[PDB]
Amino acid sequence: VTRQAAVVERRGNVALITIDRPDARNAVNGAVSTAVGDALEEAQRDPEVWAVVITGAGDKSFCAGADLKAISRGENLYHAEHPEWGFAGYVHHFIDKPTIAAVNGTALGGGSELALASDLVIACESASFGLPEVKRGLIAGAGGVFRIVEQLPRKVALELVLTGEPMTASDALRWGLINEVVPDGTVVEAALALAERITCNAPLSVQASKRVAYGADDGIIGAEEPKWERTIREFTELLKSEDAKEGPLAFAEKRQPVWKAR
Amino acid sequence: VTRQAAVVERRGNVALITIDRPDARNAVNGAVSTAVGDALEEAQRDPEVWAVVITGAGDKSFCAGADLKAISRGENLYHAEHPEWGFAGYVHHFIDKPTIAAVNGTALGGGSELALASDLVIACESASFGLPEVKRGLIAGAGGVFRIVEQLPRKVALELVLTGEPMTASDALRWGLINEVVPDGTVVEAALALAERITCNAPLSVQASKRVAYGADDGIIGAEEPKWERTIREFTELLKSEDAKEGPLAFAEKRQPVWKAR
Amino acid sequence: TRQAAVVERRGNVALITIDRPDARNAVNGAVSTAVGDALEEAQRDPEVWAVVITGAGDKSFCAGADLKAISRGENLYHAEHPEWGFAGYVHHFIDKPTIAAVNGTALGGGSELALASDLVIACESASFGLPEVKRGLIAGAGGVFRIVEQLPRKVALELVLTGEPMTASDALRWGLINEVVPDGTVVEAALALAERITCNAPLSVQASKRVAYGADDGIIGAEEPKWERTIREFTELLKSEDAKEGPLAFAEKRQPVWKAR
Ligand SMILES: [K+]
């Protein structure tokens, strides 16, 4: 349809990005990655933008992950100029400005990966997080596996990765994986309120603090680059497997998959 | 003395390893390390083994740590062919398959190190963890010191390390050090049920995710290698100290140790 | 004429007290020199098996850097050892375990002392935080990079980026600190924690500390680039107009007007 895949708007010193494909549960195709990647670069460049909020349209889904139809059309899913930014033009796209994921609904797979890549997270009551890629014969290749082990206690993170089972918003708050849980429908105002508790502070201070906290130098987190390389390497090999073909196919006939370990 | 030191059983796609020296509280000698190390390597090589559970015989002790009579006889406590696998053929023995410690009783010292080396942990209600070596004149030389600081909040890990005091299974659960606490006597069934929520997933996805989670390349966790070197160097220096003999002599003469800091 | 810190021995424990309660135990050159020396002495002395640090009184553990001393152009570091950093403490690894006995408010520099310590006991009315971002500055004494290691990442970044405080009770719940005790009783509590450590083999405890931090020859290799990054960022930030506006507005009890330069 003749509509923008994601929209951007200003609220004071805040750039609000809304993934706007609610019929597709806010799944990410190339159009989304273009719009979100461009929006982030613009937020980076504009000295008057002091914080960023990303959210999904509607109340059912924050981001369902990569768009399965787009994948089957063999479409490019990444920013066309900057594939190095990774999934949604977002996960490997460091900027100085603080980013807040306003999780308005289900956030499984790529959706959790967006939250993990963000600095701060507010989720609504009915939101949930997880990396169910292992149930599908792939892996969370947009940073999920190596970032979850850093953002949850190791044993709890490994349970989540290895079983592919979801975590409720309430449990994520309890673990310190997210910052706040709010009523469904209110996530954007809650995120803006959090942003305003940051944009009241000295912007160069907030931004310098963000770089120090991450160990970022010239827009690159040095310690993460080998994790990206390892992930890319593991993912590529995985795709050669028959199981990586079987897994998506089974979910596309609602039957259980038959794993061969090859 | 003449039973297999550790026993292996298949349960579906799960290999179940039981340390089987209940009379010695499942303390580890060369025979245990040989059996456990062999079983891990076989689980690695068998493409039909998709998860491993390790446990100890009976309801009193998961693992008492190093066999002290074996140590006093100057015996080799490691796997005879693979001393590099370290304590029990286990703690420095990375395999692609998810490992679950089914902690059936006390797990102080080496017992905690098996738990720390495993991917996931289920404990019985009366189980306890800790690294009491500091009370004797040595350190946790099987990876316990550097892994517990990664698996508990820093200040909480440091208290456990420096005091040598135990942590209950319920507290471990609350911190996210372990995954589940179950009634005494049911830990094996509970670990197998957890394993079933892993072996239902695509095995190559699960194993690739494990490698990415740990940053493992060709069976080595590069980041841990200098931590092992440091641990072994420190441990060696302590073995030679006067205080390292005062510790056990004081526990034998049923008095308080008088430390000399040499 | 007065002494700024008090150093004493209790059994095998060295007890250090910042003693400027009228300045809310803010750190100047005299504090850093005395605190640095005491740590070095605790390191050298084989009978010192643990260290406790506290502030006098019940209002303030440590208010941070002394703003008068700064405005007077004074040196705030140990006179011989700038490399030890804030209070002679935050970049000064020793083999002996250290316990921060947080006797009251501990924002800014005070939270950095807690973060640099091995263990922390706080009174009920204590609070932690890094409000530097509200002043046009940053927590350049290790606070930003250590807080993200010692609290869950999302929770740490909230603290860092909002500059809002955290109560003793929430710090305990997260495992940032080890114990919360009634006001006025932090020193007895810190010494009791210390006695649960000095009962253990001193060489074991100290080797365990080294392994736990990855310290070789008194240096935590992994933290050096983080120090360098912090110093580089701090240095550049001081050149901005906002870095002057922040402390000026605070001194003038008004809201700062940020220019983002
Ligand atoms: K040991």
Side-chain angles (χ1 to χ4, degrees), chain B residues 87 109-110 113 133 139-142 235:
Chain B
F87 179 73
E113 297 170 297
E133 290 89 343
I139 57 171
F235 188 84

Side-chain angles (χ1 to χ4, degrees), chain B residues 114-188 190-205:
Chain B
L114 298 175
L116 293 163
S118 310
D119 303 316
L120 308 160
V121 177
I122 299 199
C124 63
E125 211 177 353
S126 63
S128 57
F129 302 89
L131 308 169
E133 290 89 343
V134 292
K135 300 185 170 298
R136 284 310 146 87
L138 298 177
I139 57 171
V145 184
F146 63 81
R147 284 166 171 175
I148 196 81
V149 307
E150 296 189 323
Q151 298 186 27
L152 280 176
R154 176 149 318 196
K155 253 64 182 168
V156 175
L158 275 160
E159 171 181 350
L160 181 149
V161 167
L162 304 175
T163 67
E165 282 163 19
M167 182 182 275
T168 61
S170 64
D171 284 349
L173 185 69
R174 168 272 172 97
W175 293 119
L177 181 62
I178 65 168
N179 302 86
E180 191 173 11
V181 173
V182 299
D184 286 8
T186 62
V187 85
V188 169
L192 295 168
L194 170 54
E196 289 295 314
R197 289 154 49 215
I198 297 163
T199 67
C200 60
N201 301 324
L204 295 181
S205 287

